[PDB]
Design a protein around this motif. Sequence first.
Motif, PDB file in Angstrom:
ATOM      1  N   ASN A 186       0.081   4.286 -26.283  1.00 49.01           N
ATOM      2  CA  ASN A 186       0.695   3.197 -27.041  1.00 49.01           C
ATOM      3  C   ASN A 186      -0.367   2.331 -27.706  1.00 49.01           C
ATOM      4  N   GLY A 240       0.869   3.769 -30.845  1.00 49.94           N
ATOM      5  CA  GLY A 240       2.174   3.134 -30.904  1.00 49.94           C
ATOM      6  C   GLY A 240       3.294   4.067 -30.485  1.00 49.94           C
ATOM      7  N   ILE A 241       3.822   3.881 -29.279  1.00 49.44           N
ATOM      8  CA  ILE A 241       4.980   4.653 -28.839  1.00 49.44           C
ATOM      9  C   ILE A 241       6.236   3.992 -29.387  1.00 49.44           C
ATOM     10  N   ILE A 242       6.962   4.704 -30.248  1.00 52.99           N
ATOM     11  CA  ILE A 242       8.260   4.207 -30.707  1.00 52.99           C
ATOM     12  C   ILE A 242       9.316   4.399 -29.621  1.00 52.99           C
ATOM     13  N   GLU A 243       9.332   5.583 -29.020  1.00 48.18           N
ATOM     14  CA  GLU A 243      10.283   5.929 -27.977  1.00 48.18           C
ATOM     15  C   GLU A 243       9.714   7.122 -27.225  1.00 48.18           C
ATOM     16  N   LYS A 247      11.523   1.232 -24.138  1.00 46.71           N
ATOM     17  CA  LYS A 247      11.094   2.350 -24.975  1.00 46.71           C
ATOM     18  C   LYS A 247      10.966   3.676 -24.230  1.00 46.71           C
ATOM     19  N   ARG A 261       7.449   9.825 -29.514  1.00 51.39           N
ATOM     20  CA  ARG A 261       7.357   9.712 -30.962  1.00 51.39           C
ATOM     21  C   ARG A 261       6.413   8.563 -31.290  1.00 51.39           C
ATOM     22  N   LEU A 262       5.464   8.810 -32.198  1.00 57.82           N
ATOM     23  CA  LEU A 262       4.358   7.890 -32.410  1.00 57.82           C
ATOM     24  C   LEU A 262       4.487   7.182 -33.750  1.00 57.82           C
ATOM     25  N   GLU A 263       4.052   5.925 -33.772  1.00 59.33           N
ATOM     26  CA  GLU A 263       4.039   5.156 -35.011  1.00 59.33           C
ATOM     27  C   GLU A 263       2.947   5.662 -35.945  1.00 59.33           C
ATOM     28  N   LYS A 264       1.731   5.792 -35.432  1.00 62.06           N
ATOM     29  CA  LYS A 264       0.596   6.236 -36.228  1.00 62.06           C
ATOM     30  C   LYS A 264       0.448   7.745 -36.061  1.00 62.06           C
ATOM     31  N   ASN A 323       3.569  13.146 -35.325  1.00 58.29           N
ATOM     32  CA  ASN A 323       4.251  11.992 -34.745  1.00 58.29           C
ATOM     33  C   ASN A 323       5.191  12.347 -33.597  1.00 58.29           C
TER      34      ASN A 323
END
Length: 330
Positions: free
Chosen positions: A162, A166-169, A224, A245-248, A303
């Motif tokens: 994260n 960045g972990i979205i979910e 999340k 699922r990743l933001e970056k 991602n």
Amino acid sequence: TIKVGINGFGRIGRIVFRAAQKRSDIEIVAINDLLDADYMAYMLKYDSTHGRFDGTVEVKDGHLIVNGKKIRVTAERDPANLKWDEVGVDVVAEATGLFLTDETARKHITAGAKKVVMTGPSKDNTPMFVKGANFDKYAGQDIVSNASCTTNCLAPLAKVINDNFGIIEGLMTTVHATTATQKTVDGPSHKDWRGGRGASQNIIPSSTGAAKAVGKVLPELNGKLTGMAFRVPTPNVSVVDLTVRLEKAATYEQIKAAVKAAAEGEMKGVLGYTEDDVVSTDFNGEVCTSVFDAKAGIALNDNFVKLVSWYDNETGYSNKVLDLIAHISK
């Protein structure tokens, strides 16, 4: 040195005791459970999973002598009558699984102890701590929890991922070794029917709050993550399978490099990293609470990725119980 009393001599209590023998800041001075001292000695000396105790054990006058030091053995059902002050106990490792609230655990304080570490997730709002996630948020509380073994595996890995991408979910599965709550053949287990089915014969789906509890020690991940478990017929060592699922956008090589950097830096001794062709027994006795398996994971795209991390659900957790005891005593 920090004097520790152990309440409960189950798997965690006994492995905490073993791990404590190599430490110089902590020494175990007392054990409480419904077991004679000679039975206690037998359970310490011989272990199906971790081999013979590396040291000397003997019984004299109802107390254990372990590595030459005297250990008080009691059999009180009521924690309030434990008289921890008589042996000078600073911290109680509460390892029975029955005193996971502030009210129940506090009777150790009433009995002369200064602080308590529950070796399981609290059932009330007693604060939970995980090394590599939030030991630095400890604020002098006299009763704390070290969370669960699965949270100690998932939280350090989730934090690295994260923080960097960045972990979205995310959704987690733990493929989990058999434990003491299970049954050798199909037997009674109300409150968990699947968990009563014969452990050696079955893959057994099971609920777990570990992924949700990551949101307690890492509030930025609060809603999340969640997850489930499968219990399988191995006696020890479990594995987390984390789909995120990743933001970056991050290639798999970027992910590996970020975990390796943490394993050799800020998370050394908590998070491990391997590229070898490992299997579960290769982590029997592992002290790291999360060992990232670089070759086992797989990315669908930059991602969306599935990450794999091993943990000895007895040894790693038990060593971090001792780390929390030393931390809240600093």
